[PDB]
């Protein structure tokens, strides 16, 4: 039986990978960092409250300038906001209200979004007419669109419930490559700081590192007990943090090919909806169905502090590129900026 | 106020945006959102025709009320990872064909389509997000059911059934078994209407069921149950 033999071979290969890993575990992060002074309590105040959405917020993104933010709500509107003055810059009606993900181009020229339509729409914010227009629609996914990230103005990467992730060429509307290997719906994407690699989290309680150019899965990370809902890349680009329904964040290392640390607490049973890191990566932030967001000492796994003030599930987090502020968005219809 | 001429202008523009957002909100606030759920060839399409790759939205107006219906079928993904989006839907419309009682799934010769419908019904009725959302249930293809029941007893799907092979009894029994799947009998309601391909009363039925759902919910918020 070719099939049985192949399955046995696969089991043997998995055994080799497991041992390769236990071979690198001389000590852990929680031991090497014992001589590192704790951050201490972190207290952050709300500085700005952004009002306007009349529905649950599903996604938010920060522009590279660190002053402009895009938010999406189920009332069919994207809003671009000047965070400093709370003024709205644009309000973009959508062709459908079922929006689950939104992104801001690094240049600031385009905004992408989508969800239960199974397509990704790209809007052009710089026009002669003066109004915002759809420049293109990307279709070819067969499941809902769970996440969109721009590499550059002509390239966007998407993840979908059809279990696949795809790199699209915006000029032609074509899918140029497809990533396969996940078996569950794919929940989230994060790009490496240099754009050369990206990580996809999925409902297989695993995550995969994918080479963008080579279209292949370099490494598979596992160990979560439930679906991974949020993923972030450590600022160096050599590590990543994943959140899941287990109420546990986990830090993985790309060079050891192994989990480095877990963040958990006995009183947290709510799932993790979002994860983010500070500029230095010393602080890890996570949003929970508890209506709160908890800062964590990323090197010690102690709780450093708590943000609170939402009346519903926190759906999204983001940290500006310059590290000056943290934004949180929620089902209560409000986005708050803390510092 | 310290603002420059351009900053003052920017604020005026922001205010106009808010004004327009409020007007769109007012219109949305007056619409009825219905969710259409059915299994396979349940006659869901027939219902859609009578009323008027991703989610499909149908808009119809009856007696000055605007209804938006979402067909969320054909999504081969995890319902759990997107079902919450419909938490605020006014009501759920579920379609089950009655003729399906003697049929099995192509994918599983031993799985009765009618039991598959009941499993689906149960998975949505008792869902956490739908604790207080009522269900409008359409038992369709009653004419094929009447033609078939005289040949095959319901015991082919319900071995426990012990009634006559008459349409009027078998159909009532099927209705009961769906109604019996409601754990929250004291919180949500199941409206049932037997239907067929030639039934012009389906719109009035949905309208009346929706009307009761809205009034009952407005009363709950006034402190009167």
């Amino acid at each position, epitope marked *: 039986s070719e099939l049985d033999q192949l399955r046995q071979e696969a089991e043997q290969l998995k055994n080799q990978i497991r041992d390769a890993r236990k071979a690198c575990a001389d000590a852990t992060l929680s031991q090497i960092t014992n001589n590192i002074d704790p951050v201490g309590r972190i207290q952050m105040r709300t500085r700005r409250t952004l009002r306007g959405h009349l529905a649950k917020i599903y996604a938010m993104h920060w522009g590279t300038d660190s002053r402009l933010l895009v938010s999406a709500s189920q009332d069919g509107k994207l809003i671009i906001w000047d965070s400093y003055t709370t003024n709205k810059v644009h309000a973009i009606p959508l062709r459908s209200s079922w929006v689950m993900t939104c992104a801001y181009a690094p240049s*600031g020229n385009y905004v992408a979004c989508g969800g239960l339509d199974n397509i990704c729409s790209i809007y052009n914010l710089k026009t002669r*007419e003066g109004n915002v227009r759809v420049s293109r629609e990307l279709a070819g996914h067969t499941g809902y669109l769970s996440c969109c990230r721009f590499l550059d103005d002509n390239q966007i990467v998407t993840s979908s419930g059809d279990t696949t992730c795809a790199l699209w060429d915006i000029e032609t509307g074509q899918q140029t490559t497809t990533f396969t290997g996940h078996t569950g719906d794919v929940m989230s994407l994060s790009l490496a700081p240099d754009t050369r690699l990206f990580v996809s989290g999925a409902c297989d309680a695993s995550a995969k590192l994918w080479d963008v150019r080579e279209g292949m899965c370099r490494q598979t990370f596992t160990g979560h007990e439930s679906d991974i809902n949020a993923i972030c890349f450590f600022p160096n680009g050599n590590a990543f943090a994943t959140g899941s329904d287990d109420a546990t964040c986990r830090l993985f290392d790309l060079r050891a090919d192994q989990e480095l640390m877990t963040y958990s607490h006995d009183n947290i049973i709510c799932g993790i909806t979002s994860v983010s890191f500070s500029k230095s990566g010393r602080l890890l932030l996570a949003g929970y169905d508890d209506f709160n967001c908890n800062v964590w000492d990323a090197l010690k796994a102690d709780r450093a502090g708590v943000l609170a003030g939402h009346d519903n599930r926190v759906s999204c987090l983001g940290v500006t590129d310059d590290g000056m502020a943290v934004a949180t968005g929620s089902w209560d219809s409000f986005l708050k900026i803390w510092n | 106020c310290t603002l420059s*001429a*351009e900053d003052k*202008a*920017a604020v005026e*523009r922001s205010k*106009m945006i808010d004004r327009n957002l409020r007007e769109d909100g007012e219109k949305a606030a007056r619409e009825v959102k219905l969710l259409l759920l059915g299994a396979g060839e349940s006659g869901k399409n027939t219902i859609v025709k009578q009323m008027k790759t991703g989610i499909v939205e149908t808009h119809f107006t009856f007696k000055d009320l605007h209804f938006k219906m979402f067909d969320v079928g054909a999504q081969r993904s995890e319902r759990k990872k997107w079902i919450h989006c419909f938490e605020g839907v006014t009501a759920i419309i579920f379609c089950v064909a009655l003729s399906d009682y003697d049929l099995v799934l192509a994918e599983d010769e031993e799985m009765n389509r009618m039991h598959a419908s009941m499993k689906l019904f149960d998975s949505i009725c008792n869902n956490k997000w739908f604790t207080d959302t009522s269900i409008i249930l359409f038992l369709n293809k009653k004419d094929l059911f009447e033609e078939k029941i005289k040949k095959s007893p319901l015991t082919i799907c319900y071995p426990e059934y012990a009634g006559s092979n008459t349409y009027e009894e078998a159909a009532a029994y099927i209705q009961c078994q769906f109604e019996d799947l409601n754990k929250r009998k004291d919180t949500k309601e199941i409206y049932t209407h037997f239907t067929c391909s030639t039934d012009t009363k389906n719109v009035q039925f949905v309208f009346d069921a929706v009307t009761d759902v809205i009034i009952k919910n407005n009363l709950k918020d006034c402190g009167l149950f």
Partner: single-chain antibody
Amino acid sequence: DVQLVESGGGLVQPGGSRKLSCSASGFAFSSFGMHWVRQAPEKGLEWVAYISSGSGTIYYADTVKGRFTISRDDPKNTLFLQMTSLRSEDTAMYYCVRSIYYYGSSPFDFWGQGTTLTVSSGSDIVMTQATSSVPVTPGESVSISCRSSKSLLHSNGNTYLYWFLQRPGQSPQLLIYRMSNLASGVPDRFSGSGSGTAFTLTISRLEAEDVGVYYCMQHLEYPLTFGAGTKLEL
């Protein structure tokens, strides 16, 4: 493409009245605030009036206040100037100018062609263009300066200075907005550098197209004001 076509000019006797009209095509008229700028035969641009998007705010120059009314009809995409009690000084070419304000916008980018109106028989910020003209030749570097009565810098950190180029027989065109930013469709050779009350526009690799009159504009407060203009020649 974007168009503004003014009409309603002609000859009027003093004390009489005319109504000017600016039809708008190719853009969302409702979202854009509109201005009227007049250039007399003296070739010095003067701001006349402003109507905001939605008609919420209207400002007029002191000279025309009470004799001129600005109105917009968004459904017909038209901008109107009602001129009454016309005086000889009112003779000029009137330009309809497009402007939108939000963070990162670039107002005054699009100018109409204008109409000609002929009429028979101290707190303002003042800007000076010390040089009335500069002879230039192709390939050379050119420095055009402007000075202001008060600093155009603001607490927000934005210096509100705009540079416009009017080629002969053509409407003025924005080159630089807010001191250092280049307008779309403007070659990289043009650059703007300034501090406080003193500003410089630097043109490199000069070309025949570049030759024309250059105007500095103040936009910190109303009235908006312009300098005299510097002419390049040769």
